[PDB]
Backbone:
C-alpha cells in the first residue's frame, strides 16, 4: 500500500525537568526496532513516538517508553 500505515503516538512527560534528557531520549530510537523515529517537544513538555504497525505494536512501544526512566501518559 502506497499510503503510510505508520502510526505515531504522543505521550505527556511528567518526569521532564530543567535538564535536557530530550537529547538522550532521542538516541533511544536507535535501539528501537519497530519504532521509526521519536520527536520530543521541550516547549510542549511532551514526547512523540513514531512507530509502525507492520513492525512493532503500540502497546509494546508503551513499555519501552518507561525504559527511559520517565513517566508518560496518553495525550490522545
Residues:
Amino acid at each position: 500500500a502506497g499510503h503510510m500505515q505508520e502510526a505515531v503516538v504522543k505521550l505527556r512527560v511528567e518526569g521532564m525537568t530543567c535538564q535536557s534528557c530530550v537529547s538522550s531520549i532521542e538516541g533511544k530510537v536507535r535501539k528501537l526496532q519497530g519504532v521509526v523515529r521519536v520527536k520530543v517537544s521541550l516547549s510542549n513538555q511532551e514526547a512523540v513516538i513514531t512507530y509502525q504497525p507492520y513492525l512493532i505494536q503500540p502497546e509494546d512501544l508503551r513499555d519501552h517508553v518507561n525504559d527511559m526512566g520517565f513517566e508518560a501518559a496518553i495525550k490522545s
Observations:
- The helical segments are 21-28, 58-66.
- The chain has one domain: 1-76.
- Residues 58-66 form the longest helix (9 residues).
